[PDB]
Amino acid sequence: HEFAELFYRTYIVTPDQAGFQLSIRRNLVWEGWTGEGLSGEKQEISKRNILQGLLDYTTLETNSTELIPVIQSGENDEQFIDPSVLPAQTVKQGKDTFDTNFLKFSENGEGFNLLMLAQTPSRLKKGSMTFTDSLDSRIALKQLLISVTKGGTTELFALDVNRDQYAAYTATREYNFRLMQLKFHTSLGLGEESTTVAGAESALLKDLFDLGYRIELDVKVDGEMNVENGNGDTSLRALRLARVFDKEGKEIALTDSRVSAALSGLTVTGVGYSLEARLTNINQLEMGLLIDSDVQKQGFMIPTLPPLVIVKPAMVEDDKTYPRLEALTTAYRIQQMRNNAVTTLLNRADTLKSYLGVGVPHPIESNLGLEGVGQYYVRPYYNEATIDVLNDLNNLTSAAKQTDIQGLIVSKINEMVYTADQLTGYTAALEAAFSGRSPKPHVAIGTDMRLPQYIQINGDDRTVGIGYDYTIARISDLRMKDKIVMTFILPNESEPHPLQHGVLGFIPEYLVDFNMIRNQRIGREIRLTPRYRYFNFLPIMLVINVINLEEAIAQRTALDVNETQVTPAS
Amino acid sequence: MVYTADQLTGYTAALEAAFSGRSPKPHVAIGTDMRLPQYIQINGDDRTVGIG
């Protein structure tokens, strides 16, 4: 029969065994080093599947060589700006949680030693700086902080300057074989919708912002930096309001009444700046990102089932009171592969309902409630939708009603297939498990005997969607009335491969013919003792409920006239 | 109506079991008076009694 075969793959085992254990492998990416030494007990650890790194983008991203200046209270406060302007910022690197701020300018003062300042607590524990740690080739400005002051109100702006035209240190030799020179010659723009550090529009510039005007500030900053001893310095040379543009792009003179009124009393003063520098550490102190592996074992047991007996007298031979053994074989078929498949399938549906919620995805191997070895490969996912054909059928011609009832179901089923595929990343899992062959998913359709005449299409590949293979199986059980069941299947494989939706552990067992007395009567008995079990691997299932179709055809299917309120009612 | 009768009666399985080999698709006899039939017969319209 088709229905049981389609969803559950047949898997035969020798009669001597009682079950099979499945070996699965996993590659893990994790921030390593449980604790910080060696001790007892088990602590608390996390591991991330590398495939889950495909979906989320923060799994394997680490910066352990970025030199962020680290505040040390009472030892380096003079090289940081006064904290009365901008409070310190908590920045997370590895495990250390420290505070940072913008380095202060100076002109006639001595330079700052960048390397000694950025000594992180993790580096504190491992010892002081070495003399062999040298800065990377690229050293560039990260952030400029300027203050526009009018009266007693101070406004702070975070004008990003990184990866601009002139923002990269360049090599030139005047003193040493290692010096780096900075020529930040450019005018920066302060747009008509840019926001302050504390968020929301600044108040001191509202006049130009309303009329769609922007201001141009010419900035000249110079700098010297040595990539061997961390000694460097930066000078602020020029900063001033330069030009004002209109919203459409012509210069407006400073002498204009509006511009002159808006810019009266404004002062722009440099405060701080941040350097982005990296440690091209050859001898290395950073520990990177560990990789791990682990294996998981899963047990599977195959039980025995009650027998089916026929009794015939042991003095007269019969072929009518005992129909030939084929009767028992047919009874065995109907008992086993008709009812148990459906019962297991619907039990899986209800269990998924109970556990996985409705339509809410789940991280990889994040739940333990279900049978599954594909549970190590794709996100668990369960979604259902009901179709009220009475309320959801477009029609303007009763001759075209059949095509429309086709199209509604087809579009909805395509939507469900797409949403499952997209949210669980199933195709990526297939491309990972198999090499050299990326198979488009094959989607099975399980329905009852009269619904296919309205869902089938010969002429479109859209029956489950383009580039999709679908096979409709029909079963007559009334538990399957008005219900659609779908899942992903690999058709060409017949082995316990964890991406199978389910495997039917089936044993060959044969009748036992003999004479036997029971409560003092004579007769021959034939016992047929089945053993078989349905197992489930894939935790993905979608349910489509079709209802109200009878009155849908029977009753008028009016065009659901959507007005939009052109009358005094909105 | 024909599909619903097929569902609730199980006629198809009966035919499949009773006759070995060929599994004839069911026939539907259509009986009416002089007036209607010219309207049941198609003049360019979707399906007749349904495929099969």
Side-chain angles (χ1 to χ4, degrees), chain A residues 101-120:
Chain A
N101 206 4
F102 300 77
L103 294 174
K104 187 191 54 46
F105 303 90
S106 48
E107 287 173 44
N108 202 56
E110 61 187 1
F112 62 92
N113 211 333
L114 166 72
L115 171 62
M116 175 214 91
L117 294 174
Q119 184 178 2
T120 62

Side-chain angles (χ1 to χ4, degrees), chain B:
Chain B
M1 216 51 78
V2 165
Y3 295 152
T4 315
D6 185 338
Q7 269 306 75
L8 275 296
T9 60
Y11 188 68
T12 300
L15 276 296
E16 293 179 353
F19 291 13
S20 298
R22 52 153 182 146
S23 178
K25 64 152 201 203
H27 279 197
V28 188
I30 301 307
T32 185
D33 61 357
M34 294 299 291
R35 172 141 183 247
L36 290 171
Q38 179 181 211
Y39 297 77
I40 297 95
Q41 179 262 4
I42 58 104
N43 300 338
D45 291 331
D46 289 7
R47 297 180 177 154
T48 63
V49 298
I51 62 182

Side-chain angles (χ1 to χ4, degrees), chain A residues 153-179:
Chain A
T153 304
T154 293
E155 300 285 344
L156 294 174
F157 285 78
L159 271 43
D160 169 8
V161 298
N162 192 359
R163 60 209 295 160
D164 291 331
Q165 181 43 45
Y166 292 98
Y169 289 3
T170 49
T172 182
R173 309 312 200 205
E174 174 270 329
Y175 180 51
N176 186 292
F177 317 141
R178 293 279 87 183
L179 186 60

Side-chain angles (χ1 to χ4, degrees), chain A residues 352-489:
Chain A
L352 283 184
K353 176 68 68 67
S354 178
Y355 283 162
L356 288 175
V358 176
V360 172
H362 293 106
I364 297 186
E365 63 179 2
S366 44
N367 170 50
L368 301 190
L370 278 300
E371 293 293 328
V373 183
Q375 203 268 333
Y376 293 115
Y377 280 91
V378 298
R379 289 181 166 174
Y381 177 71
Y382 169 74
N383 196 57
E384 52 275 29
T386 187
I387 301 306
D388 191 0
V389 64
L390 183 63
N391 295 347
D392 291 331
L393 191 73
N394 287 280
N395 258 321
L396 291 79
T397 298
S398 306
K401 185 176 180 180
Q402 274 282 50
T403 316
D404 297 344
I405 193 40
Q406 183 204 90
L408 174 68
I409 301 298
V410 163
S411 66
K412 186 58 174 68
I413 190 182
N414 293 4
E415 178 67 358
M416 289 313 80
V417 172
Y418 284 125
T419 189
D421 189 359
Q422 158 60 239
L423 268 294
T424 190
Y426 159 90
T427 66
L430 275 296
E431 296 149 7
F434 292 170
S435 185
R437 179 66 179 86
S438 176
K440 299 289 95 176
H442 198 322
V443 191
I445 301 300
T447 65
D448 61 358
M449 191 75 148
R450 61 91 172 174
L451 196 143
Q453 299 326 113
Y454 300 99
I455 190 188
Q456 63 74 60
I457 297 186
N458 287 264
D460 288 14
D461 286 310
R462 301 298 291 252
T463 315
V464 294
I466 193 60
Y468 289 125
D469 291 331
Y470 63 97
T471 60
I472 297 102
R474 290 192 292 268
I475 190 175
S476 297
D477 196 283
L478 265 292
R479 286 179 285 222
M480 281 304 268
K481 205 199 159 181
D482 291 331
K483 264 182 51 43
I484 297 183
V485 184
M486 302 175 328
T487 185
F488 296 125
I489 297 92

Side-chain angles (χ1 to χ4, degrees), chain A residues 72-85:
Chain A
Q72 293 273 330
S73 179
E75 195 211 314
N76 64 7
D77 63 358
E78 61 266 40
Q79 303 110 332
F80 295 105
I81 193 51
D82 294 331
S84 301
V85 171

Side-chain angles (χ1 to χ4, degrees), chain A residues 16 30 62 148-149 166 173 192 272 302 307 309 339 405 425 494:
Chain A
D16 204 13
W30 71 303
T62 48
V148 53
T149 300
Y166 292 98
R173 309 312 200 205
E192 57 178 74
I302 297 183
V309 58
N339 291 321
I405 193 40
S494 86

